Amino acid sequence: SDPLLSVLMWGVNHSINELSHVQIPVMLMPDDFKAYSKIKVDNHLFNKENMPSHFKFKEYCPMVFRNLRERFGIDDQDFQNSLTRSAPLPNARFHTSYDKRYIIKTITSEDVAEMHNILKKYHQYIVECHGITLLPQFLGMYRLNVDGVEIYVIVTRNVFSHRLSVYRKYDLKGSTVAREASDKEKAKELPTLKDNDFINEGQKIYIDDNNKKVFLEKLKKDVEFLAQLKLMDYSLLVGIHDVERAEQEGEFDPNIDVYGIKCHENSPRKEVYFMAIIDILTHYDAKKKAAHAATVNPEQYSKRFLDFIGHIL
Amino acid sequence: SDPLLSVLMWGVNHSINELSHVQIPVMLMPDDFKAYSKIKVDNHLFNKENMPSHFKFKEYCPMVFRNLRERFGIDDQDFQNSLTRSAPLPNARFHTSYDKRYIIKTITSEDVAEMHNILKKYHQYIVECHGITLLPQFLGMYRLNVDGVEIYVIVTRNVFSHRLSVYRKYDLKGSTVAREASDKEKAKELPTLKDNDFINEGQKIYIDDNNKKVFLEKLKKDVEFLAQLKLMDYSLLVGIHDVERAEQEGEFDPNIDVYGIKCHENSPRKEVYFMAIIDILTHYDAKKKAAHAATVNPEQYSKRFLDFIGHIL
Numbered sequence A, B: 001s002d003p004l005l006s007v008l009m010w011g012v013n014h015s016i017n018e019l020s021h022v023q024i025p026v027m028l029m030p031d032d033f034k035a036y037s038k039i040k041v042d043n044h045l046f047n048k049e050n051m052p053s054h055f056k057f058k059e060y061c062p063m064v065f066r067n068l069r070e071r072f073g074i075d076d077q078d079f080q081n082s083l084t085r086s087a088p089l090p091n092a093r094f095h096t097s098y099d100k101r102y103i104i105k106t107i108t109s110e111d112v113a114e115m116h117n118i119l120k121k122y123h124q125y126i127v128e129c130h131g132i133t134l135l136p137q138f139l140g141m142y143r144l145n146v147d148g149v150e151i152y153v154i155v156t157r158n159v160f161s162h163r164l165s166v167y168r169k170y171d172l173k174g175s176t177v178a179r180e181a182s183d184k185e186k187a188k189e190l191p192t193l194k195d196n197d198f199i200n201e202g203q204k205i206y207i208d209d210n211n212k213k214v215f216l217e218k219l220k221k222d223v224e225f226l227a228q229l230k231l232m233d234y235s236l237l238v239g240i241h242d243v244e245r246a247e248q249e250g251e252f253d254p255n256i257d258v259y260g261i262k263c264h265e266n267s268p269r270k271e272v273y274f275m276a277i278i279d280i281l282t283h284y285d286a287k288k289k290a291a292h293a294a295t296v297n298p299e300q301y302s303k304r305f306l307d308f309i310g311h312i313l
């Protein structure tokens, strides 16, 4: 029904099948970070029901993202199934894989240029921390062309659980400038609440001391890495699963819901938290271009961010 | 090892997989005979070991050939396996599928234009006779491009058995002009003998009266159809399996070895014959172009052919 979506599914399927025939070495070479594969399909008076008649599909750095998927505990055949067995659902357009494991976000060519710019350092950071990080997990990046329409997509891991539902959702930046959800926003079903809502509504996260220390430790290293790359406008995405409210209408596989953290035993309510960094691809200069056409530097953003999060936990 | 061969395997695999998702109706529409699918692949700094980095694959009239394959008793998944599980072996270049079921012949763009010209009438002839014919069975036609090299291929059914070996092979035209294998030819392992060899060496085909009548009946209708289309230079390909000689170093599946005919009970030797028409795509005018650059019309060729074959049986 959405032809760009069908091209995406077809393309991911194609990409994973091609890779299944490649010998995967333990290491990446420098050219792997400059690599791509392009397919251009032209059907004349054929197969009109399933696909657009004319489309292109490009995959950036196939070997790097295959390496990353395995590092993030993701098997290629599973990834293929999640994205192609049934269509992704809509919810920058966002889609969620049918099994809720992956997020598919539509991005700009500028974002793509920035992903390329950091991809090597990102990969090496992922190696150093053995894949244990709150950073977005970049799993695939593609360019889709359907009859004059060109779009770029990136695939990442869902911060939230593929099983346990989230009834409350926050997007935190820790800005000295006031951030708040608008009144039209709060009227949404699962609204994206922000820094002021959290500060004002006295939201508490009830996790024990060991879980808190571990989390903030990860968070520190991740955010420094981001600062170092002059990246900003990223958030801590926080999801709360209410085990009680879920029974009205509660444990997780930590190898799938990798961001889950159980509340401690004295929590007023049975809760599971899902917390991770999102939206890192805006470079300082790219934010300035959107502030010109339509104090707050990378390092400051970094400090404000860690201050706020250290406070809210 | 042969990059054109790898593209062919990759392309057939791709084509059959795409078709597996198409709804196949009982009928073909006129546009199906003008249809094609094209794929162009560009790999930059990727997948260098398995495929050329730049290639194109085109399939002519995918729906027609899918229809023909089923009419000829061939399942698409089996066809795919036969052509892609292991490489075709060489033997106009000819290859044989690894399981000896199919012949893959390299043809000219002129041949391709002629196949398109007759494809509708051919299909309708195949419908009328319910697939019971000595004509070549056209199963797929493709264009391959690998770095400046463009080639066209047609896939047909092997005349000979996929199991039982052939120790003697004839190529008969029935020309009033003398046809003979040369002395350098007879020195080949499995030589392609011709009209004079057969007449001179008193070769006999020992088949009973019912088998002979049925065969010549089919042959008559097939050759008239060919004459009608002004086609010529085609042969009766005759293969002889010696059951005795085969035991030194004998029955067949008639649903796979569709051209097999057992000898009668009084045959001097246990023999199985494999006989069918081959090489039909030379149009009268196309033969004249190769007679100019480097009596014998279509109807005469037709008469000479049926006279000779009626004589040899």
Ligand SMILES: Nc1ncnc2c1ncn2[C@@H]1O[C@H](COP(=O)(O)OP(=O)(O)NP(=O)(O)O)[C@@H](O)[C@H]1O
Binding pocket: A092, A094, A103, A105, A156, A157, A158, A159, A160, A169, A171, A192, A237, A278, A279
């Ligand atoms: N990895 C993820 N898992 C689950 N939900 C996500 C994820 N990424 C984004 N979302 C949801 O999508 C919303 C917007 O994500 P984001 O990537 O910040 O979009 P954006 O268009 O870049 N917004 P902006 O901050 O204006 O640039 C978030 O608040 C989440 O509700």
Ligand SMILES: Nc1ncnc2c1ncn2[C@@H]1O[C@H](COP(=O)(O)OP(=O)(O)NP(=O)(O)O)[C@@H](O)[C@H]1O
Binding pocket: B092, B094, B103, B105, B156, B157, B158, B159, B160, B169, B171, B192, B237, B278, B279
């Ligand atoms: N369908 C088939 N099954 C088995 N063997 C075949 C088949 N088609 C061709 N061959 C073999 O390949 C040889 C040449 O086939 P043919 O298609 O006549 O080639 P060609 O290059 O068109 N020859 P020409 O007659 O000079 O145009 C035959 O004599 C057979 O030995």
Ligand SMILES: [Mn+2]
Binding pocket: A233, A234, A235, A278, A279
């Ligand atoms: Mn954001």
Ligand SMILES: [Mn+2]
Binding pocket: A233, A279, A282
């Ligand atoms: Mn953003």
Ligand SMILES: [Mn+2]
Binding pocket: B233, B234, B235, B278, B279
């Ligand atoms: Mn011939």
Ligand SMILES: [Mn+2]
Binding pocket: B233, B279, B282
């Ligand atoms: Mn020929």
